[PDB]
Amino acid sequence: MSNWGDYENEIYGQGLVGVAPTLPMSYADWEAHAQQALPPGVLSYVAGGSGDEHTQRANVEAFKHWGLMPRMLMAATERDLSVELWGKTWAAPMFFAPIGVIALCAQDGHGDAASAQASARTGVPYITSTLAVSSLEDIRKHAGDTPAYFQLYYPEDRDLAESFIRRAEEAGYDGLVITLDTWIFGWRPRDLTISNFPFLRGLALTNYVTDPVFQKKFKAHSGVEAEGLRDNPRLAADFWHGLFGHSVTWEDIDWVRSITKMPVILKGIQHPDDARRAVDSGVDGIYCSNHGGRQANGGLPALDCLPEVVKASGDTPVLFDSGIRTGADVVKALAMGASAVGIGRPYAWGAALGGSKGIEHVARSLLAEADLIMAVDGYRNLKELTIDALRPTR
Amino acid sequence: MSNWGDYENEIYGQGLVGVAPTLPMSYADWEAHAQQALPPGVLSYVAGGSGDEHTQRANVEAFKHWGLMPRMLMAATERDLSVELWGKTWAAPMFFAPIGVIALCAQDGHGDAASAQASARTGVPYITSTLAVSSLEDIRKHAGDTPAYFQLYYPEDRDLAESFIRRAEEAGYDGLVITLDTWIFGWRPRDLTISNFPFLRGLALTNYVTDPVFQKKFKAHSGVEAEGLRDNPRLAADFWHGLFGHSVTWEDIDWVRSITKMPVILKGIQHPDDARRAVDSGVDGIYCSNHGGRQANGGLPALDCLPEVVKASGDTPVLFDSGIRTGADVVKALAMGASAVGIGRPYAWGAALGGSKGIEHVARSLLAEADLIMAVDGYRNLKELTIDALRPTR
Amino acid sequence: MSNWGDYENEIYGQGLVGVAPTLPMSYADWEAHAQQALPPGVLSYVAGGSGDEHTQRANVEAFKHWGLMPRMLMAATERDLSVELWGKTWAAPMFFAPIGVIALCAQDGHGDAASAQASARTGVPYITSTLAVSSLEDIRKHAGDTPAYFQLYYPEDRDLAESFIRRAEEAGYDGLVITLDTWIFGWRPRDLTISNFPFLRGLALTNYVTDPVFQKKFKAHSGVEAEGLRDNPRLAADFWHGLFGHSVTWEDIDWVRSITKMPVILKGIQHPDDARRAVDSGVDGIYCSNHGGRQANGGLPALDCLPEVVKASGDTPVLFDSGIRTGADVVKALAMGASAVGIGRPYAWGAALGGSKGIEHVARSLLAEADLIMAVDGYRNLKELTIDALRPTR
Amino acid sequence: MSNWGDYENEIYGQGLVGVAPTLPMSYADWEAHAQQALPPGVLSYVAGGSGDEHTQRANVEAFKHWGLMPRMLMAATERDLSVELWGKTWAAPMFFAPIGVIALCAQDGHGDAASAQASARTGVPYITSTLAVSSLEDIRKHAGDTPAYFQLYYPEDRDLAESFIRRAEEAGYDGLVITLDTWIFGWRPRDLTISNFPFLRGLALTNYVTDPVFQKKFKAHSGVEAEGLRDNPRLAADFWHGLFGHSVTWEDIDWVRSITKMPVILKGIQHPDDARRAVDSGVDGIYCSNHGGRQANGGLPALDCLPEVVKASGDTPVLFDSGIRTGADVVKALAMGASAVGIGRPYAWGAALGGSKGIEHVARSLLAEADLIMAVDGYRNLKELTIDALRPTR
Numbered sequence A, B, C, D: 001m002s003n004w005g006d007y008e009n010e011i012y013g014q015g016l017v018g019v020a021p022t023l024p025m026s027y028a029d030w031e032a033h034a035q036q037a038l039p040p041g042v043l044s045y046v047a048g049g050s051g052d053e054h055t056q057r058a059n060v061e062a063f064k065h066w067g068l069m070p071r072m073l074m075a076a077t078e079r080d081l082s083v084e085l086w087g088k089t090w091a092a093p094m095f096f097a098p099i100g101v102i103a104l105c106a107q108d109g110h111g112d113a114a115s116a117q118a119s120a121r122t123g124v125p126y127i128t129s130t131l132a133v134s135s136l137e138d139i140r141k142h143a144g145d146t147p148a149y150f151q152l153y154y155p156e157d158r159d160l161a162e163s164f165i166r167r168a169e170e171a172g173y174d175g176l177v178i179t180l181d182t183w184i185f186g187w188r189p190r191d192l193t194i195s196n197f198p199f200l201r202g203l204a205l206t207n208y209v210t211d212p213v214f215q216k217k218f219k220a221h222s223g224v225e226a227e228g229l230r231d232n233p234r235l236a237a238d239f240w241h242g243l244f245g246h247s248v249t250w251e252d253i254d255w256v257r258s259i260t261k262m263p264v265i266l267k268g269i270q271h272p273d274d275a276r277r278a279v280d281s282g283v284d285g286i287y288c289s290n291h292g293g294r295q296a297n298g299g300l301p302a303l304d305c306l307p308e309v310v311k312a313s314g315d316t317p318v319l320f321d322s323g324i325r326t327g328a329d330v331v332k333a334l335a336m337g338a339s340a341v342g343i344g345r346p347y348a349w350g351a352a353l354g355g356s357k358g359i360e361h362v363a364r365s366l367l368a369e370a371d372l373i374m375a376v377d378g379y380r381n382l383k384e385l386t387i388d389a390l391r392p393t394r
């Protein structure tokens, strides 16, 4: 280890012997190249957000209106970016946010296994979506020794919800993330224009196809056996659609907590009283997010919500995503009080240009830049990166 | 002299006899032409900043949000733009900020000697970087009668730091600037993309190559004699890299002050309590700067910091750089309470289009415009240019 | 596979069930997307040609000035596009031309194996370069039952030449292609500008590092043994450079024919007298080419040479490459008398966007269009497609 | 220097140790960058041609319509590009054509000395214009051991003409070039638009101001003596204008040959009957040119004239310029029978980006490409490169 910023030294070292980089170095170049390297349906699905995309863009723009105050003569020559979350020490305050189509962002069709392997090699935890090409058991093996988390899309069948949760616990996941802001799909003009919706073609349904409860219920509905389902998952895509999206209730959350020992983390919280109610009810983690503006175009940047969610959450850890594009953004969200920050769009582009090694380069680039900003600007660890280190800017 | 604004009269005078200008007249045209006139590696290194460059750009944008209030019927027909700093009278409240690769911005490879000669001819002080092609002794001779300042990059070897400081004092430098915000290098995507890092190819290492301490220590490490080092400085580039960047401490600053009679000026201060602590400890000068946003992309414009640094510094002089592009910006930073303002990017472009005469044209153009704004808007000297002469603007 | 044109029916069939294509369908879109999907050094090497690239462009433009005359009421409802070459029946009159960096055009770094697998699945013969990441023995296995050809870069060392030739025969290759137009590298501004030359970094040298003659001669030269060479091929990159480019003579061709039973095919012939002298010498095939304009910018389109080379070659087969981009170009070169047509740039783009499946899509797209043109315009087989089916066009 | 093409090996060699090129490698990039690096008046003068510039463009376009036929198995592993002209052996069949404002294309204002030094280092002969900042005596010294030629602008004063001719002989020049197509200046919209005409400002008149005949005649005309003239050459700009342009006659050429031992070379010949009459007169060289289309926009490409001028000139050497941009063009003009080819616009750009080293890079780049084309395409020397090696192309 010594420090995440050391990553730039190998890049410069290789140039001295005539070995040029092969992947881009900034989000802008990641996005521009990766968008052209993808099939058109995958590009539409990944780049696209809800409505006219103002929220998706405003999430990113929010980071331009905070500045870190540099502190001189601090000699922050060794940084400690580790964080302890629900009993596990993370090597970095950053994680791969769940992406249901990441498998298709890689040319080999296994971008989800690629992400888990990148997590094994880097120490950056992976959160698998419920939607995936590799089963959650295989993903957890690919993540090696790195803490791994399971994101539940709570289905409209409690036996299936319990089966997923049980499977995640047995597979060794370190926590359960329940996504609250996508139980129906928002208006997404780019996908609508070409009527693009991959899961209805039977893609990324492996966690259902491999589930005993889903197999039995689909067989009762259709007569189709588990082997036929595995050979053509699209046979069950309409059945999947019928049970995909339960609208979760507070009572559901109480029931989930009572059937698992995993810590439960609620994803999509923006209002501080929702954070307050959740923490007062025993929820282990708050994950402040608006799903990258992909599911509703209501206009409120996710970052605008983070300080009051942090206040309301007290000592309950708060995760943050929606709008992170560079290591500067990582540092700003951490200074606002997020315990760790999730990466979405950037690592989908990584997958498109280089599979597992591309994802890793994205993660190492983001952490290198965050660590170097902390070094230069005089913040030696995350405990010292407090909210009074920021200033609002024009 | 009479006044810096007189420079425009020779430009218009020459047009009357059919002699057109040969160099550009505005920063935009300096930048656009100079960028094309440079080798690609030098362009990447000079234009590039840290991360997505938001800080580098916000430094410049800050100046658009202050307006000088014009005062009529003041008859400011003679301006006094002189300033007295640590016992020396500067003819202008402006200086060339240190640029470690300025030598390579000129086609002849001696852009640093060119800058010093431009300083000799104009009265605009030159601050030599520690990184340079001409030794600090030669630079000081080229600066003629103009006050000249030495910028130290404090190395990870106290014998070498003392050798540099001693050499600067003996050579007749008027002050020592210690840069605090670049002891490790920030994430710089343009340079990373092409793995561009000139000093590791042995460029601009002349102050080390000519130093007795560095020669002896490198010879102990490598067996290489001082003549071989001079003939191929790249032999020592890895050794240079190993000692380049000491992370300076408050105690280091106390030690530096005790071994030199030069005034000591701290470069990179942004936080007012860092200014306060420095002034209370006997530091002679505060140099408010964020290194043009080149080393950390934390988002806080340098100008946003200047008023509170000025308040905290009391009667200790405050220098300012990061974002100055025209004479209007010079006047605004001076009205905020900087004693003098440093020029970076603009004079690198000057060097690229015209060597020493290009650098001089940049300096004379900036001062002409500042002096004419003061004349027209009714401010006859710098004492009258106070912070209440500005207004915030949209 | 009744006819190559049937490939379009699967594409349309799938859209009727809501499955959109994922790869582009025209050369212009292959090129546009693939160029963005590649690392910058591979893009420069693959897209770039010699000089100002007029020859590379003129090769392509030449196909715009020949038009096929449509014949109605011919009921070409079954097409025979097969060709018998040196005793083997090709299912298509088309092959993958040798590309020494094809390995690096795919993200997994094994685009050469990927090409051989696409050849195994399509029946379109692959010609491996002497430069490769997989050994020629491994490539031949990957090509399955499809005829495969070995392209020799004749080295400045006859023992090594004989080893390569013997290995290819033993490995089961069906012919030996000797490239006559790259024993020295032509002026290539795009590569020169970034000083990009992959082989000197020890890339794609596997056929040398696995060769017993090369191992012994390099071990004699440097001291390093076979394992140190397999572990760091760059140790031998300078040695490779010294022997890579023997300027072949007529006497060498005589000698080559005497040590192999394989048919010998000369690549790079443009002048009819060269083709006539080769055939009189008992050379088995003439491969009309100008290396895509990548080695010399002399300005003569390859297609302009093809009719006279065909005429001078008598009953000896003529292969043709340099400027093929679509299936229309394939039909025009066959009509001028090529027995089979080589594909270069287009399948590099295929590798970049889809590995082996992308290469396969390029090949099946070209053949589908050529087959459909023949069907619609009334040419039932390659015998009926002759130079008098063509007209010059403005 | 075994062959000119070896220049590419240094460029690639340096990239292997992380040293990137600093100058462009193609004419398109030389032109693009140099045009931005120049003062606007020099750009207008250098880039601009006569009228709507169709002739200047058509000169260049003509090279796109000739293609060199590649010859295989010629083993041209050693090339002889030397040429013997009027008793001197040139190492290259290429020279720097006269450029009367070349001094001002370099930033230091001495681009003419810089060209002569590049000639001294490369062996590519320099032809100095009568218009220059360095005296013809100083230029000849700067050219070292390389043959040098003096281009006469024959003045309306035979005493002055005789002085110039005598000075060039005494100074050691190897030939006298008489330019026949600029005794009056053609319509040049780019210069007219900004009324740009440098010589009338007293620029580049050193050969007149240092001439004893000019000094006496001007002193008689105006009253000012030699020192007042050396100190302000613009005093004599109107007088220079009055005598600059004598329209040369056949009788003048007879007279010139009688007063010098130097070979006499006529520049601007396009019509075969003019070449035939000159050779019959005992003129030593024919210099086929249309002044780059800079003086008259009549629309005939210079290259279109070259074959018939060669044929009419018998065994008298023919030089050629007007439209050469790359080494491919150099090969094509030599193949049509030019004994040597002149370079204009390209080395002005070289001066603008790099002074003498930039000029040298342009020259070595052109020759490297020409040499490599000859090697790859099978032409061992200039004798083997004849007009039947070429084909017309669309």
Ligand SMILES: Cc1cc2nc3c(=O)[nH]c(=O)nc-3n(C[C@H](O)[C@H](O)[C@H](O)COP(=O)(O)O)c2cc1C
Pocket: A045, A046, A056, A059, A097, A098, A099, A100, A101, A129, A130, A131, A151, A179, A267, A289, A290, A291, A292, A293, A294, A321, A322, A323, A324, A343, A344, A345, A346, A348
């Ligand atoms: C293509 C794509 C698919 C996604 N699928 C999921 C998912 O399956 N489950 C989930 O909780 N969030 C999903 N998200 C939301 C991400 O977890 C995260 O909240 C979001 O990407 C952050 O916004 P940003 O990418 O704009 O920074 C997805 C995001 C993207 C880009």
Ligand SMILES: Cc1cc2nc3c(=O)[nH]c(=O)nc-3n(C[C@H](O)[C@H](O)[C@H](O)COP(=O)(O)O)c2cc1C
Pocket: B045, B046, B056, B059, B097, B098, B099, B100, B101, B129, B130, B131, B151, B179, B267, B289, B290, B291, B292, B293, B294, B321, B322, B323, B324, B343, B344, B345, B346, B348
């Ligand atoms: C190419 C370049 C190199 C620099 N090298 C140095 C240096 O050697 N030492 C130093 O203290 N600052 C260095 N700086 C920072 C400048 O002193 C100054 O703070 C900065 O240029 C102001 O930002 P601006 O150019 O955006 O206005 C350099 C600046 C540039 C543009």
Ligand SMILES: Cc1cc2nc3c(=O)[nH]c(=O)nc-3n(C[C@H](O)[C@H](O)[C@H](O)COP(=O)(O)O)c2cc1C
Pocket: C045, C046, C056, C059, C097, C098, C099, C100, C101, C129, C130, C131, C151, C179, C267, C289, C290, C291, C292, C293, C294, C321, C322, C323, C324, C343, C344, C345, C346, C348
């Ligand atoms: C990137 C690249 C590398 C090449 N490598 C080789 C090689 O190793 N051996 C060879 O005989 N020809 C080589 N060629 C030339 C090709 O076999 C073929 O002649 C050329 O690609 C045809 O021109 P086109 O691609 O413009 O249609 C290469 C071509 C490309 C694009």
Ligand SMILES: Cc1cc2nc3c(=O)[nH]c(=O)nc-3n(C[C@H](O)[C@H](O)[C@H](O)COP(=O)(O)O)c2cc1C
Pocket: D045, D046, D056, D059, D097, D098, D099, D100, D101, D129, D130, D131, D151, D179, D267, D289, D290, D291, D292, D293, D294, D321, D322, D323, D324, D343, D344, D345, D346, D348
């Ligand atoms: C800026 C410039 C000035 C010129 N000056 C002269 C000159 O003093 N004497 C002369 O004989 N030709 C002169 N020429 C013509 C050149 O010698 C040569 O014929 C022309 O540049 C060739 O055309 P090209 O540059 O378009 O290839 C000049 C050319 C240029 C570009």
